[PDB]
Write a protein that binds this ligand. Structure first.
Ligand SMILES: [Mg+2]
Ligand SMILES: [Mg+2]
Ligand SMILES: [Mg+2]
Ligand SMILES: [Mg+2]
Ligand SMILES: [Mg+2]
Ligand SMILES: [Mg+2]
Ligand SMILES: [Mg+2]
Ligand SMILES: [Mg+2]
Ligand SMILES: [Mg+2]
Ligand SMILES: [Mg+2]
Ligand SMILES: [Mg+2]
Ligand SMILES: [Mg+2]
Ligand SMILES: [Mg+2]
Ligand SMILES: [Mg+2]
Ligand SMILES: [Mg+2]
Ligand SMILES: [Mg+2]
Ligand SMILES: [Mg+2]
Ligand SMILES: [Mg+2]
Ligand SMILES: [Mg+2]
Ligand SMILES: [Mg+2]
Ligand SMILES: [Mg+2]
Ligand SMILES: [Mg+2]
Ligand SMILES: [Mg+2]
Ligand SMILES: [Mg+2]
Ligand SMILES: [Mg+2]
Ligand SMILES: [Mg+2]
Ligand SMILES: [Mg+2]
Ligand SMILES: [Mg+2]
Ligand SMILES: [Mg+2]
Ligand SMILES: [Mg+2]
Lengths: 66, 103, 117, 271, 88, 70
RNA sequence: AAUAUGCCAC
RNA sequence: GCUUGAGUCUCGUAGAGGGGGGUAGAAUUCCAGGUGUAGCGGUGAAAUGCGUAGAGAUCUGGAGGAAUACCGGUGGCGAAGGCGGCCCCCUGGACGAAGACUGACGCUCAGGUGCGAAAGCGUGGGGAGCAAACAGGAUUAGAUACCCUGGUAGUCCACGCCGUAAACGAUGUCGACUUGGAGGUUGUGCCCUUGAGGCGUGGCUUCCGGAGCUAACGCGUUAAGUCGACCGCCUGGGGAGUA
């Protein structure tokens, strides 16, 4: 119920692990707020960066309907 | 000598030409004295959204220790090579020699 | 004349009017009906009942194509998002997919200036 | 360099001059010059066909290579030169086999630059390749309209043509006029814009500056007499005519293209 | 931002000890090296005002240190400006 | 906000699930936000005002918890 | 949806 | 001479700090076409406007410009103005830990110089959307306004100029001292990471409040408390920030 990344000690959310990245995007492809997901601010920023890079690399959708 | 992560996704029709691409690129970097530290071919993956009406593409990852100059010639290579449909090169804090999460 | 069986119903419900269009799965329109054409002007043109009437009229106008099931795609923020789908299912088409396709720019252009009524 | 002059005299007050310092200050390359006699606008009948031409400084034609035929032989830009016959500057280049030539100077070129023509030329400014090898979205100059005929599009100073698409054996180009024209894929082209882009910023400042370029005075039609021009005549400054050329054709907005032979290569007008 | 090796060379060539990183001539030489390096950057980035502010800060720090050196020990100041090529 | 009516899913519950999916995506809120253009000064001002009122409400709430009324 | 104005000591 | 001010070096840190270059998807608009009919669009109602010359709707493919949904946070950075997609190159500042180094090298600043939102101006481009001006419809006694339908400059870029804003935490910069509480953000140490825990210590930041201060409202360790250094500024209102 806390930030899983600071629970695990990982300090960067690598954008190549879509299995983790999916946990933090709504089914409509939007990023889930840090309030909802419980992630602390630093990892939320890192997570948003990684999500955006994955969206560029087509590993995640920019949105559900394309 | 800066650590780079190069991900480029290739037109599926050129899946046979991807090994040649990799060999010539690694030859260019090693000639420029830069070291490739990681290299893995994701194969042909489906796309989360169509690119140029293409729904599948051949992903290549490679982490290098190349000079910024030779990285820029690889930039122009990806630009003027019509098979590489999308490329992204990133500076990393350090070299990564582990195994990518998609392996 | 042409038989399509499996159709797609685009509802376009703005704050002032609801346009319901039945097409095949290729975007080829088969018919349409509007809350303004169903006999509603001004105050009443944009009410869920008006949207219901328009959807019913469109369903009846697209009858001879023999449409059995419909995808449903909803666009706009208008009141005609609810009663329109209700009226479609009451008409009898098997509603198999309901999607919101409202345009949401990912920034996008600059909206019109705010009114001062 | 766009350097305004100083108003030391009424003729120099408004003069603005583009002083490029990289231009060669010596004499042009001799073996590529030719005699270029003026005409005055007179054709072989001796009548003035194109008015408002005559006089002007004597000039010598520089055989500029608009074909870039010598392909596969790299050429180093010996120097840049002033060409009187055109708005752009030219570039004396020297191939590796000892032949010197003149080319249109592309933007950003200098002495010592390497250039090359052919299919395997490096896609860099100054080089020449067929358009089936030039990437889409490129900006080019010295565009050929027929394969091997020679460059004809985008040769003035600072102009360029954008390759917007490729459809089979044709490629679609956006020209400086805004026109959208189809050109065979094998027509050559040279990369980059044309140099001397500042050329349009120069202000002549006086009538003599125009006369130095062989541009005779231009009498307004309404100053003439009714026998001389449709606009002429009038006790005072009168008009009342729809503006027309001296030969009666309406001159404001009346389109005059009529080439159905080549209407099939125009994808969109400039309007 | 001078490279670490460049900083080491400047300290070694201007200070008494290789660990003498705080000496007045060491500081002035570091500031001069960075300013000379940044001149080329600001020849091609005229509108980089925020970086120009840091450059001006280094200019003023060098001026203050040079005034301190001059009013303290003059001979060291003269030798330093000779080795650095600063007019005053 | 795309839904798929599943096996043995009646129309009314399919519509209800679609309603809740649309609200979860918040689409109508964004459309009513984008209907007009509001200046950046207005955006900042109203964001600050909403935050201020939320803080005041919560302080009043967990302060009146320590208050007897009747 | 429209809904302007109010000079004579106190 | 000394080092506790000031500064440099060593290691890392977080960030919409800046300049340059490229690219991504969503969306509006336009162009070509396909299906497809009589409405659409708009309003408090309405009309102007668009449409049977086939609109609106829907689908395909292009073009081009501008801005970057979600993340998003009285969150972050910046001297201020301000800065938010992603990537790369150049680059400024802040901060923390341990040590070494220099040894008052400092604080302020008239005149001076630089930066300085938006509007605006000059030249050359660009122009999707929005929109002063403008035109039409409506409202009204009037309506050169609000509302509606269109629409040009301009918003966009390169360079140059303007140098003003409720440029505001209406609070000059620097330094020292003087009860607390609840957060937020960014490091760093200890142990037990024994369940993301506590225990400290730094930096910045938000709200409440104590003594004190204040005309009161209020400020309240980020003072408007107690003092020091320097600068700017005020002397009834209007005239007038005008001549
Ligand atoms: Mg409106
Ligand atoms: Mg003759
Ligand atoms: Mg003429
Ligand atoms: Mg004239
Ligand atoms: Mg006349
Ligand atoms: Mg006469
Ligand atoms: Mg005569
Ligand atoms: Mg005659
Ligand atoms: Mg006549
Ligand atoms: Mg006359
Ligand atoms: Mg007369
Ligand atoms: Mg007269
Ligand atoms: Mg008359
Ligand atoms: Mg002053
Ligand atoms: Mg402006
Ligand atoms: Mg004006
Ligand atoms: Mg302008
Ligand atoms: Mg202009
Ligand atoms: Mg326009
Ligand atoms: Mg009017
Ligand atoms: Mg208007
Ligand atoms: Mg002022
Ligand atoms: Mg402000
Ligand atoms: Mg403020
Ligand atoms: Mg003030
Ligand atoms: Mg000061
Ligand atoms: Mg701050
Ligand atoms: Mg308080
Ligand atoms: Mg006071
Ligand atoms: Mg004045």
């Amino acid at each position: 119920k806390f930030c899983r990344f600071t629970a695990e000690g990982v300090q960067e959310i690598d954008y190549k692990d879509i299995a983790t990245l999916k946990n933090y995007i709504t089914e409509s492809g939007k990023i889930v707020p840090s309030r909802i997901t419980g992630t602390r601010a630093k990892y939320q920023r890192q997570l948003a960066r990684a999500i955006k890079r994955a969206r560029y690399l087509s590993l995640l959708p920019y949105t559900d309907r394309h | 000598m800066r650590h780079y992560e190069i991900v480029f996704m290739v037109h599926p029709d050129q899946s046979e030409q991807v090994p040649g691409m990799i060999e010539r690129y690694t030859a260019a970097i090693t000639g420029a004295e830069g070291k490739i530290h990681r290299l893995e071919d994701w194969g042909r993956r489906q796309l989360a959204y169509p690119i140029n009406k293409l729904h599948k593409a051949h992903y290549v990852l490679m982490n290098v220790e190349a000079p910024q100059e030779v990285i820029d010639e690889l930039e122009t290579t990806f630009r003027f090579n019509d098979a590489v449909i999308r490329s992204m090169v990133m500076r990393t804090k350090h070299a990564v020699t582990e195994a990518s999460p998609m392996v | 004349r042409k038989q399509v069986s499996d159709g797609v119903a685009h509802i376009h419900a703005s704050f002032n009017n609801t346009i319901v269009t039945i097409t095949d799965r290729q975007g080829n329109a088969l018919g349409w009906a509007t809350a303004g054409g169903s006999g509603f002007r001004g105050s009443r043109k944009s009410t869920p009942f008006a949207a219901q009437v328009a959807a019913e009229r469109c369903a009846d106008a697209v009858k001879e194509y023999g449409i059995k099931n419909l995808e449903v795609m909803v666009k706009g923020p208008g009141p005609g998002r609810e009663s329109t789908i209700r009226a479609l299912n009451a008409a009898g088409f098997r509603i198999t997919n309901i999607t919101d396709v409202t345009p949401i720019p990912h920034x996008g252009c600059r909206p019109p200036k705010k009114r001062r009524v | 360099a766009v350097v305004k002059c100083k108003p030391t005299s009424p003729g120099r007050r408004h003069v603005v001059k583009v002083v490029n310092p990289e231009l060669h200050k010596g004499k042009p390359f001799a073996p590529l010059l030719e005699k270029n006699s003026k005409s005055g606008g007179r054709n072989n009948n001796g009548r003035i066909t194109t008015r408002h031409i005559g006089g002007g400084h004597k000039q010598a034609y520089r055989i500029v290579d608009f074909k870039r035929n010598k392909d596969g032989i790299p050429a180093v830009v010996e120097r840049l030169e002033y060409d009187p016959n055109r708005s752009a500057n030219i570039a004396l280049v020297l191939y590796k086999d000892g032949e010197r030539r003149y080319i249109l100077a592309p933007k950003g070129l200098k002495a010592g630059d390497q250039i090359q023509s052919g299919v395997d030329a490096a896609i860099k400014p100054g080089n020449t390749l067929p358009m089936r090898n030039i990437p889409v979205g490129s900006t080019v100059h010295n565009v050929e309209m027929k394969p091997g005929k020679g460059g004809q599009l985008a040769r003035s100073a600072g102009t360029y043509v954008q390759i917007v698409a490729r459809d089979g054996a044709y490629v679609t180009l956006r020209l400086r006029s805004g026109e959208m024209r189809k050109v065979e894929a094998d027509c050559r082209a040279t990369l980059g814009e044309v140099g001397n882009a500042e050329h349009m910023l120069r202000v002549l400042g006086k009538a003599g500056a125009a006369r130095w370029r062989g541009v005779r005075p231009t009498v307004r039609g309404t100053a003439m007499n009714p026998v001389d021009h449709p606009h002429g005549g009038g006790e005072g400054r009168n008009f009342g005519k729809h503006p027309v050329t001296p030969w009666g054709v309406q001159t404001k907005g009346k389109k005059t293209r009529s080439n159905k032979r080549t209407d099939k290569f125009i994808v969109r007008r400039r309007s | 931002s001078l490279s670490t090796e460049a900083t080491a060379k400047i300290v070694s060539e201007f200070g008494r000890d290789a660990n003498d990183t705080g000496s007045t001539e060491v500081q002035v030489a570091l500031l001069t090296a960075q300013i000379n390096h940044l001149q080329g950057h600001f020849a091609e980035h005229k509108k980089d005002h925020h970086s120009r502010r840091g450059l001006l800060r280094m200019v003023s720090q060098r001026r203050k240190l040079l005034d301190y050196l001059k009013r303290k020990d003059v001979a060291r100041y003269t030798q330093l400006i000779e080795r650095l090529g600063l007019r005053r | 906000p795309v839904i798929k009516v599943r096996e043995n899913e009646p129309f009314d519950v399919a519509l209800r699930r679609f309603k809740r999916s649309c609200e979860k995506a918040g689409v109508l809120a964004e459309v009513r936000r984008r209907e007009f253009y509001e200046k950046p000064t207005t955006e900042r001002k109203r964001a600050k005002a909403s935050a201020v009122k939320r803080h005041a409400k919560k302080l009043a709430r967990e302060n009146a918890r320590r208050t007897r009324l009747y």
